[PDB]
């Protein structure tokens, strides 16, 4: 939302009403000096800084989580190749679950229908199993767990090597919880609330308290200052929705294609 | 808002200063802005650090709770994956894990666990659990006996027992982390004196503002007091993430989620 | 007498000295404005802010270190119960080592005498061994490990299950190193050196600069600015020795109590 | 940078010889407003430079891990299979291939020469076919370890100890990829840069009122401070970007090669 | 050094007083307000920077903490798992102690030969000295000891593994210290911040003088002290393996390490 070019423009308009209405000032007895707006301005900058910090960390964590999908699924596929080179059937099954897991997680975070993707990757019976669950993505881990478990029952994996691969499903479990946590735990609203008020009220009142000092250069300076606060406030906005579909949000489709392309590269009998 | 009170209180004090500004020279009282710029910026800097510290507590607490869901999900998965047919154990262990969550929430909210416990476990167990001064720990220990017995009975190997044992440790770390964020507050000086300071600063501020703003002073002073006081109380809220304030953690919702997860479809699983 | 008040009262005095002496300023050739004191005050506030941040983090780390003791001991005893439910002989021995470890750790950090706490807990053949070492706490860990080792040699623990319990001793190992590191490595004394000087001198010289602008108001404002600064500075100092005996420091006594009661509860004592 | 210092001096000299015309027209520039702007920018640069620094440090840590993992893997190979020098040499090849290949991948440069020197041409073709060559190298390292296991020279346990090390390299590969196909601040980084750029150009105009002829000196000093801090952030933000200092990455890949040749007695020269 | 810049600063204040007369005449005005802006900017930057420096120092301290922990726990595992193998005990301890001293040498860029000779047979010294990285070669030798115990069937794969993990931890320590030592952030950008604070401090009185007159040097020195104190403390912490006041007592830390390992293996300093 580029209300930035709206507020920038609404700012010019506030400068102009300030310039012309500057007379009726002492009649009334209303004075605005810079100094107390420097105090508030500074306080707001500090609080914006700390807040944007949190915003940024949340977005970084969203990237890291998704990064771990790629890492853990890569490594699970590696272990399967290196430990069971012969077993391409199991290879293909486990891969399709891992790929399904990624897509499913994207769908869940975007609240979209994973049915088509699941159906492209899995047999109908497995899809039914997945979609029947109140927690589909988590049920994909269970099914992948079951493949690993069969290999174990059949003696193709020992307890040790079964365990090496289980750890990978643990990591994917940490991704899934993390994303869920992030999705339902925003940076607290109070922050963005408080700050949105103060930053808007501030950019509004500002040309009024600059007009005393600047006369005609009010608009050009009040705009430059306001853009600075709003640019910085809006970087938070652009970082607060990691899973969304906006241009600034995570390109989750491409990340899913990357994951799928990677797992497919590591298979094919080679 | 206890804030709306003190915001209005700041408007009264701000009128007082508009009426007093002539009588300044009579009484002998000059008051420039610049010392209040100095003081205000210091307080802002300290409010920044304090707030950041509070948020960290919030975020750790949120995370420790996230681990409950993860760890419990992976323990159930492992039991389903390794002992697919052992539904009686599945059911027993899941109820301990669910008891674990609720018990932890009660522990931290200082409320009575009994209703939630009885809902989930047989009564002998509820008394074994309520008998301990550490009920959450006792639930963990009981959950441990379940996997221990599967091992004694040769149903788990040492390896596979260990994979599950790891998950109980993960929950032990949550229990410990949560107890540390609960019993251990951030010292009472931090809040006690910082609140004094922010308020004292806010009331005096217009006295120093008049000379410059004259009439506009009640406005531009309430705006400043909002900013400082908003920030201070939010910090105070977030410091106690298991409290029942608006910006604290939805502990009830989070246990509902955990429960719905483990018990999803009468606990039925494929293969 | 309480130091902070003394420094406040020494500041109300510094202020009067400044009101009375403002007359002589013109004469003696001393002009003092607020603006440079702003620059300095802010600078000091910034550095005070980051400094306090470090002190808090040190306090938090100590807290976490102690939290690990309770976690790792609980899970060790839990494992002992879950893996060897019959072997209460070993349970009791190991639990007493774990309880000794905490008290030993506590006393070590307080630079006090473990003898009573250890005598309350262990046999004399062991207490003297432990006190014979310049590293008692590490020695208790070595002994807890013997227990776990014996159970392994006796075939009661497999290599694997031994392994599971070994990790928990490692975790206690890290707590010991951490606490020792915090006890012996201070927040560089330079932090308290530069900041105590600077903050005191600043609060002192400040009324001399406020008087120009504030006159008889000087005391009120200057004491305020001083309380803010000194309050923040002293908070850093209290947070910095987390292992101290102040009421503002960690209640190590209560924590070791919680630990002991906890492991006893788990063994049915 | 030096271009923007010279432009700042030019803008200063303009500010001086035009101070007359403009301030008479009713267009004024005080210092207090630009002091508010500049402090806020400074605050933002501070927070920004912190995010930057920490991406730089994360890059150091990831590359640190390569050094650590690769050393410990080769150590394990020697301690567990002292006799299997052919395997030692193959595995060391892939490990060193991995480093160089990662470096090439991050710096968008050609890995071919490094691969051709280290590996058989079959392997190089396979690696070069893949859209993920670095990952492929790890996969090849994996087969080496996997074969020693299949041949019964490694047990599942000791296989596992080495498998850990490969996972560590997987974490590095991905972390680095994430640090490259960055950033996270989606080119706001150009906004703040222009904000600083503009602030520094308007600055002499806001200053000349108070400084007159001293303007260019005090304006350039301030500009230098702001522009430097901004430049530092830009450097730090982008550890793998096209203008990055390649000395340390090259030093690291050289160190690991040297260390591993040392560990497998390929150094020193025989007598 | 700090006292040099302070004296040079008292001098420059006088230059500003004596030459304030010519100010009007030469056509040079210098207000406080612009210097406040620069000043606060720089303070913010020093605040952030100093905090990065402290972070590095705390990490360095921590890494050394792990040497002690990992080494203690390795010896512990050796005693608990192989109580009879006291030859191995002694040889591995020799390597672990060699490791610490060699690490100090590496970080101080000094010769490890004396310390190595005190601890190990000459054949082993030659092997260790021949390597581009003596500390890495020491871990490999420690690794053969446990490896040989594994070959001989005296350790299982599992118990070898528990011990392997500790060597893995030492490798991590080595790496982290290597990273912190060779981690001059572009050598340019610490020299640039130094000239910055320096230049600012020398120009400050010229700007302060209009307001302060004779008081210039007092305020100007107080301010310069504050900023320089901050800046130089950062520089110390930035290089924790150096030989400055507030840099790690690495020789003391190595002594503690050696003493601990000797204590654990029944030997007497
Ligand atoms: Cl395949
Ligand atoms: Cl394949
Ligand atoms: Cl897990
Ligand atoms: Cl634990
Ligand atoms: Cl017992
Ligand atoms: Cl018992
Ligand atoms: Cl490693
Ligand atoms: Cl070789
Ligand atoms: Cl992995
Ligand atoms: Cl070799
Ligand atoms: Cl350890
Ligand atoms: Cl010994
Ligand atoms: Na261990
Ligand atoms: Zn992993
Ligand atoms: Zn295949
Ligand atoms: Zn979005
Ligand atoms: Zn986990
Ligand atoms: Zn079941
Ligand atoms: Zn008025
Ligand atoms: Zn643990
Ligand atoms: Zn017992
Ligand atoms: Zn008995
Ligand atoms: Zn005594
Ligand atoms: Zn490692
Ligand atoms: Zn070899
Ligand atoms: Zn002039
Ligand atoms: Zn070499
Ligand atoms: Zn003039
Ligand atoms: Zn360790
Ligand atoms: Zn021995």
Author numbering:
A (entry chain A): 21 to 290
B (entry chain B): 22 to 292
C (entry chain D): 21 to 289
D (entry chain E): 24 to 294
E (entry chain C): 23 to 291
Give passages from the manuscript.
Human bestrophin1 (hBest1) is a Ca2+-activated Cl− channel essential for Cl− transport in retinal pigment epithelium (RPE). Although the structure of hBest1 is still unsolved, two Best1 homolog structures, one from bacteria Klebsiella pneumoniae (KpBest) and the other from chicken (cBest1), have been previously reported. Overall, the channel is a pentameric assembly with a single ion-conducting pathway, which varies in diameter along its length and is constrained at two narrow points: a “neck” contributed by three residues (I62/I66/F70 in KpBest and I76/F80/F84 in hBest1/cBest1) on a transmembrane helix, and an “aperture” formed by a single residue (I180 in KpBest1, I205 in hBest1, and V205 in cBest1) on a cytosolic helix.
The corresponding “Ca2+-binding” sites in WT KpBest are occupied by Zn2+, an essential component in the crystallization buffer. Notably, the short extracellular domains of hBest1 represent a challenge for quantitative measurement of the surface expression by labeling techniques (e.g., biotin).
